[PDB]
Amino acid sequence: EAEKAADESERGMKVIESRAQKDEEKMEIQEIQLKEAKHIAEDADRKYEEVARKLVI
Amino acid sequence: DDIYKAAVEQLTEEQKNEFKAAFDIFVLGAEDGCISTKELGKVMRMLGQNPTPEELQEMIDEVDEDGSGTVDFDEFLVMMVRCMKDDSKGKSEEELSDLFRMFDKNADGYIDLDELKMMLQATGETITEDDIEELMKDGDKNNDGRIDYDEFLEFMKGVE
Provide, as residue numbers in chain A, all residues whose Cβ is less than 8 Å from the Cβ of B45. Answer: 42, 46
CA atoms within 13 A on the CB side of B118: 9
Q: Residues with Cβ < 8 Å from B85, sequence gap 6 or more?
A: B49, B50
Find the length of chain B.
Answer: 160
Give bridge partners of residue B147 from the DSSP assignment.
B111
CA angle A37-B34-B50, nearest 5°? 55
State whether B53 and A42 contact (CB < 8 Å). no
- Residue pair B147/B119 in contact (Cβ under 8 Å)? The answer is no
CA A31 to chain B, closest CA, distance in angstroms equals 19
Q: Please, which experimental method was used?
A: cryo-EM
Distance CA B80, CA B102 (A): 37
Indicate the residue of B42, B45, B53 with minimum beta-carbon distance to A50: B53
Q: Which CA distances in Å does B19 have to A20, B40, B84, B113, B144?
A: 40, 11, 11, 40, 44
Q: Are B19 and B49 in contact (CB under 8 A)?
A: no
CA end-to-end span of chain B: 15
Resolution in angstroms, to 1 decimal, for this deposition?
Answer: 5.6
Q: With beta carbons less than 8 A apart as the criterion, state whether B26 and B37 touch.
A: no
HSE of B35, CA atoms in CB hemisphere, 13 A: 22
Residues of B in contact with A46 (CB under 8 A): 45, 53
DSSP letter for each residue of chain B: -HHHHHHHHT--HHHHHHHHHHHHHH-SSS------HHHHHHHHHHTT----HHHHHHHHHT--TTSSS---HHHHHHHHHHHS---STBS-HHHHHHHHHHH-TT-SSSB-HHHHHHHHHHTT----SSSSHHHHHHHTTT--SSB-HHHHHHHSTB--
- Rounding to the nearest 10 degrees, give the CA dihedral for residues B43, B49, B54, B59: -40
CA distance B66 to chain A (A): 29
Exposure string over B123-155, b if 16+ CB within 10 A, otherwise e: eeeeeeeeeeeebbeebbbeeeebbbbebbbeb
CB contact under 8 Å between B45 and A49, yes or no, is no
Distance from the Cα of A43 to chain B's closest Cα (Å) equals: 9
The Cβ of residue B157 has, within 10 Å, a number of other Cβ atoms equal to 13
B37 φ, ψ (degrees, to nearest 5): -65, -25
Tell whether B138 is in a known binding site. no
Nearest Cα neighbor of B33 from B66, B82, B81 is B66
| B144 appears as a binding residue in the annotation | yes
Side-chain-side CA neighbours of residue B139 (13 Å): 20
Give B68's Cβ-side CA count (13 Å radius): 7
d(CA B7, CA A6): 72
Residue B97 neighbours by CB under 8 Å, 6+ apart: B149
